[model samples]
Target: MKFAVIGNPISHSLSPLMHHANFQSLNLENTYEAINVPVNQFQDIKKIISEKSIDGFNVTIPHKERIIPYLDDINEQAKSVGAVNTVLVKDGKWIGYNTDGIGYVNGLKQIYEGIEDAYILILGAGGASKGIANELYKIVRPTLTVANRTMSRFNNWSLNINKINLSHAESHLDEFDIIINTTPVISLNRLASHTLVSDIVYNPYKTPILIEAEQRGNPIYNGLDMFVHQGAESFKIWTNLEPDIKAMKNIVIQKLKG
Candidate 1:
């Protein structure tokens, strides 16, 4: 089996490492690669997946939006989120799926159970935030609110969820029971007491907001758990096998240790 992750500046991704590790744990014969496909060069889905026998792959960064035109069909999750993170080439047609939001809520469940009633704050209005918001609405059904740097970027989005200015989001920290940051921004206000804070950025492991939340004695989460859960869902989408989540987590932790 062959799989890949497509993006520019993708060397920073650990997707192949996790996928390959999962394969080894299950004794599955498969190869997952990272291929840097610039936006202008992304129209080659036929050659990459069909011609090369590439099974499926994940889309990241710029390509996630640009890839929509090339896909043959996309699931409601991807369509609703307005982004495709995972794509499957079954029966010779490209089928898109989004595991990002499901992955996130799944991870969140491990720490904070019963999210359906919590007042949630999404810290960014970017693509990941869209997927997370859409999925959270379906599963968690929390009173959702989203905040971003500006309204112009979100004007083109369809999140129907309430919007708060990024500048003001920090001020309204008292209103949310849970805050999840999808932005690359580092300096965020400390979360309120009893609030659960999550940062989708995994590289730093301990984001500034999380650190501040920690000092404030608030609940916290990093993105690594969400990443593994989403990749595990993608694994299930491609192959019927249930991946060992622990194996996936261990490999990611190992990479982060470096």
Candidate 2:
């Protein structure tokens, strides 16, 4: 079977490396590649998938939300998240599902406990936040706050959570048990020593907020686990087999070091 991760600026993606390692370790003899689907030309995806005979593909960046219209069916999770990261093509039907959020929750559970009682503050209202927040809500009714630059951006959101402007997040850092940075850039510098700081950007291995959190003696986690877990979930959806989690993580770590 063939799979590809589609997005603009696709060169930055480590998905192909991660998935290839899994296939090799599992002896699946499958092929995975990264395809650069330039912005605004999303319609080309259908043609590309057909020409390449791709059984499934991972959507990234600008295309996650854009790929929805092309799908024949969308799972409730992806639909609720307002984004699609994984798509399965079979019997000429394109099905969409999101593994990003659940992937994040899976990793978080390893380092943190009592999610049901912890107050979580998620910074950013974009795609990543949407997916993560939606999944987090599924497992916990704990207070989940969505902080963004503008409250208007979340007007269409279905998740009923406290919303705050980015400007005010710093003042309320002490109120939450967990703080997550979903934006690509650094937005917060100070963190309460008791809160766990997580950044969704794993390329640097340690993002600015994570570094700051660590320097202040706070617990921290990177986006690597989320990335790997999401890929694993996507792999399961495509082949109904669990990918080698260690192999997937090692390949990404090895490449990031190079």
Candidate 3:
């Protein structure tokens, strides 16, 4: 089987490293690559899939929401989240799924002892925030709040969170046990203190949010963990083999550090 991850500015994606590690560990005859699909050219994705025997592909960044209309079927999670991260191509049909939330929840669970009763605050109202909110609602069921600089986008995200069963949803920032930031270009020097911070921006390894969290004596998690775990989930979906996350994580870190 063959799989790939598609997005613009994909040269920095660690997905190839993570998925290839899984393929080697699981002994699957599968190959995974990263393809840069530019904006306004997503419609060509259907044609690309038609030309190849790709088992599936992961969508990222600008393509997450834009890729929805081109999918034949979308899972309830993706529909609720209003974003698609995992695309399954079966029988020539493109089925979209949002594994971002599930992957985030799973990774959080592995790190935190208990999160069900925690108060969670998610920063940013973008697609990545939607995915995290969706997964957090299902697993942790925390008192979730979302904050964004733009009120209009924040309002839209608040509505989406309510639709996904996120009670106590708000656009204003306040105190919380966990705060997940999905914005790529923001610094966290202005955020509240002592909150467990998770940033979805991974390329830099040490995002401003994570650094602030570290300096504040708060537990911090990076997007790299979520990226690897999500890639592992996608690989399992494609090859029916559980990936060695430790090996994958080491490989991803090594590559990113290189």
Measured by lDDT, the strongest candidate is 2
Better of 1 and 2 by TM-score: 2
User: What lDDT score goes with residue 99 in model 2?
Assistant: 97
Instruction: Give one digit per residue, the lDDT tens place, for model 1 in 1-258.
Output: 889998887898899999999999999999999888876767775676666688889999878877888889999878877888899988888889999888987888777877888899998877788888887887656558998878887776765678878767877778888889887753446456788889987778787778888888888899888899999999899998999899999988987886
**In angstroms, what RMSD does candidate 2 have relative to the true structure?**
2.6
Ranking by lDDT: 2, 1, 3
Question: Which 10 residues in a row give candidate 2 its minimum summed lDDT?
Answer: 184-193
Off by over 4 Å in 2: 39-42, 166-168, 185-190
Residue pairs clashing, model 1:
none
Q: Which stretches of candidate 1 lie over 4 Å from their true place?
A: 149-160, 166-168, 185-190
Q: Estimate each model's TM-score.
A: 0.87, 0.87, 0.81
- Quantify all predictions' global Cα lDDT against the true fold: 0.84, 0.87, 0.75
lDDT of 3 by residue, 197-243 (tens): 78875767678768866887778888777877787777666556678
Alpha-carbon deviation at 93 in model 2, angstroms: 0.3
